[PDB]
Amino acid sequence: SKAYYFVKNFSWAEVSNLLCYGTKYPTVLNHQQKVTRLYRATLRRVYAHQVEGYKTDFKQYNENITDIGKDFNKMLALKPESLELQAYFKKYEDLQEELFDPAMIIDESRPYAASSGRYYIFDDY
Amino acid sequence: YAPQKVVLRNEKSGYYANPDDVARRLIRLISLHDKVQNPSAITLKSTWSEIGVDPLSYVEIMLEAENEFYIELADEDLERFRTVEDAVEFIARNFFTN
Amino acid sequence: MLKNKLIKFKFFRFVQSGFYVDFIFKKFSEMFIRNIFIYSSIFFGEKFMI
């Protein structure tokens, strides 16, 4: 996944969409796609804050991920037009915003990472 | 030393990691999950629904898979995986896989 | 003191970002660059005055 969050002149809405969903335009995704992508983003953020953190507590991390899993299992079985599902989306987008770090650790395998494209590879030509 | 002659790139087998090692590690990680019933029925041709992996447990497993293989996978790549073979090939063909 | 807003992540990221000084300074510099350089210099000067 390309980590170009800050090297393009993006607004917060675009960055929030890219953080919560793998796209700038989440309106073109299915219900299941949206639920799974939000669940993956939430779990990734919780791992980045409660396992690879400052003073990490494993017990609290397990409690929080269990609660998040229960909530997202409820989310999956709901209907797209329901207001409760919209409230759940809003809650977890707010959670993603509240844990946002301007100093995110970017994996070195991502296209726009800190050490990406450090060498020019010559082709057969 | 380089032979001081024109040498082209060598693609070899196209795998940057051992496919068998990747498959065994991935299948062990899958079997570690609670909702997977038996590890002995998992095969490279097995579909995630056959072994009892609903999409939420699928994302749970694929997060630990990227933690275990020292890589990170995009949403579209994970969405395109239909069986264990697809994920195994994608991981084994990754340049950053350790 | 039983509650402390300074141990929450908002204040933590505020301090870690260097009090947002770099972000504020870069935003004004972008405005200067865009307006002055592009609009005034090339468009105004060359297209109208020259």
Binding site: Y119, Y120, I121 | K12, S13, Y15, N18, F95 | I38, Y39
Partner: peptide, 26 residues
């Protein structure tokens, strides 16, 4: 361990220019 192939050319992906370059963004 494993006989790794050469470094892939995908390490430097080619840009495709999906959008027009505005003269107001010079």
């Amino acid at each position: 361990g494993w006989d790794r192939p050469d470094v892939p050319l995908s390490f430097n992906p080619l840009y495709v220019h999906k959008r027009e370059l505005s003269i107001f963004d010079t």
